[PDB]
Amino acid sequence: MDYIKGMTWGWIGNSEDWRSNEAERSMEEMTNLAINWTAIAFQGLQETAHSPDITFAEPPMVTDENVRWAIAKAKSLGLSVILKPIVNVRDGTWRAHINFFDKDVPCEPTWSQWFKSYESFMLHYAKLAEDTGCEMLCIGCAMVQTERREKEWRDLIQKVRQVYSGIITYNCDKYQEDEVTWWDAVDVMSSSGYYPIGSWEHHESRIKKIVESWQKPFFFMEAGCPSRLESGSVPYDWNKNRGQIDMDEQRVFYEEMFKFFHGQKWFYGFMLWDWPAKLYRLEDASENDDYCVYGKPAAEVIKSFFTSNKIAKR
Amino acid sequence: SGLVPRGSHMDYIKGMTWGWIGNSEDWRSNEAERSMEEMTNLAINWTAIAFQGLQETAHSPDITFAEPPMVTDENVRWAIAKAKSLGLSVILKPIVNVRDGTWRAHINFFDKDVPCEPTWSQWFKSYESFMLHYAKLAEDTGCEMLCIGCAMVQTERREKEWRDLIQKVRQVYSGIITYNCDKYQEDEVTWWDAVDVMSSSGYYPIGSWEHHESRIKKIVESWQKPFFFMEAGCPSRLESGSVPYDWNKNRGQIDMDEQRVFYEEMFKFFHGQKWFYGFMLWDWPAKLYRLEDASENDDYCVYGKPAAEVIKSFFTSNKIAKR
């Protein structure tokens, strides 16, 4: 299994953004992080957390051609690719709340309905990932309230294996590394490393014990922090202190994360969050509140970490 | 206790729910008194005084209650006293609704406590303040029964918290406790032993009632508790009888006969069985439409519709009046 030096590209997955002349320049600029991987991330959509139907590849979401382009462009840039189709909820609910009754009842949509819709979604992109030679497929992201549906997840993974021959991971949410009973069904364990400033040493200890109990490769499928006042205390909170710029907060987050998670032989690195298809101008970086590190001191932390000899050795 | 709640805390319920959704301005109108009086002509001996509390979303921990536009404690004392002045026994039914429109059965939190999310512990503390406020009001006003929840499906697996809440309720409220499970869920609640009386929402489709009588009879016999319907009803709308629970189905498409048929079937299969303790019907508004408007009204309400006559002949029939 490769050590991942990664940046996520393309989120939220807007066809008009991905087809702009600006998208190619954005992906080229991302290579200056000294990454060898990118996660091509884009959304699918369902109306509510309790509705069974997932829409994908319809305006304003990415076309299959947009996706083929992003994968081919990344690979042309010498990057290995994780394809990362993510379901979002149109009403704004966090996808971790997607959930149905344990008991099938005639008056409600069922797990079986939602899983059929999720299978259509994920198998569509699994076939794309096969056709385009994606090195890895991420079959879900922080789907916390679905994870107890163990038979349905294992049945989905078996269908994925029949159409996709690359590496499979599932991205569990922050704090959830020990809560997935079906890690054995994927190749590589992964989680969202949005752990607050001051907690990384504790989480390195906690996660090491989980990964050694499973004896499987682990890496962070997401990790990052907005360049905002006190974002480092809640790096996952994309709504905290919008417009309140703090470059140094984001830098401190990255320096601590890499102090504790580096070269350990059980650890396979970082897919960072994230890098837009339409990138702001360098001159606007110092006033930008995004997760993106472009033009910010955290980018230099990432570059020196990814080019350092201990990490270049993995 | 089993088939009979302990003496210190079973009647056959002939009930109609009153006051929903629980708007202070509606309850304080002159019309509220006339509405409740008119309800007694159903030959009911019980009413459920039903009103909402609110939380923002299905995944937020804070419940607001007794703030505009919701019912004041004085509005509630009034409805309970008026009902009792009319000879009715009272079920107090505080119900949590979600401001964003989400069905309360989806109210839910992560099984694992995590630093980044609201916890079950936070929601149960807010739910306890809500339900203990009304449990104390039920005690002060002498309500015969308290319903401690309604179709909270995605909370029901939290057995320790539900049993802990019920023990706190027992400390402030000495009457009969019921919990109203959702349609189809009668066998899915693991803590029925902690309440006095089992109850469900009887919104079963036309053509299914014989089947549900058999299904429910076996569930009730396995628990050895009294059972009744804490809700049951059907809108007077085209094809409502196929989905009696669906308050959004075919609005403004009037069908008096569909509601009538629903009631006739329900009473054909659920009547006088000794394990069964009757019906709290859904529902009756604080502000009642005029009789002359009844034939054009699409609500659950039976006032001025053929279904009212099915209900009255059922509730006054000697078989039922002797329970």
Ligand SMILES: OC[C@H]1O[C@@H](O[C@H]2[C@H](O)[C@H](O)[C@H](O)O[C@@H]2CO)[C@@H](O)[C@@H](O)[C@@H]1O
């Ligand atoms: O879901 C849309 C928002 O995503 C945000 O990034 C999230 C993302 O959902 C992801 O899957 C993860 O687990 O947490 C990330 C960091 O908060 C932002 O990109 C935001 O702008 C989007 O609206």
Ligand SMILES: OC[C@H]1O[C@@H](O[C@H]2[C@H](O)[C@H](O)[C@H](O)O[C@@H]2CO)[C@@H](O)[C@@H](O)[C@@H]1O
């Ligand atoms: O919740 C507001 C709506 O309630 C409806 O009646 C429901 C009610 O929520 C109840 O607890 C139950 O289990 O089902 C009832 C019948 O659908 C209607 O009164 C509707 O008008 C309200 O908007």
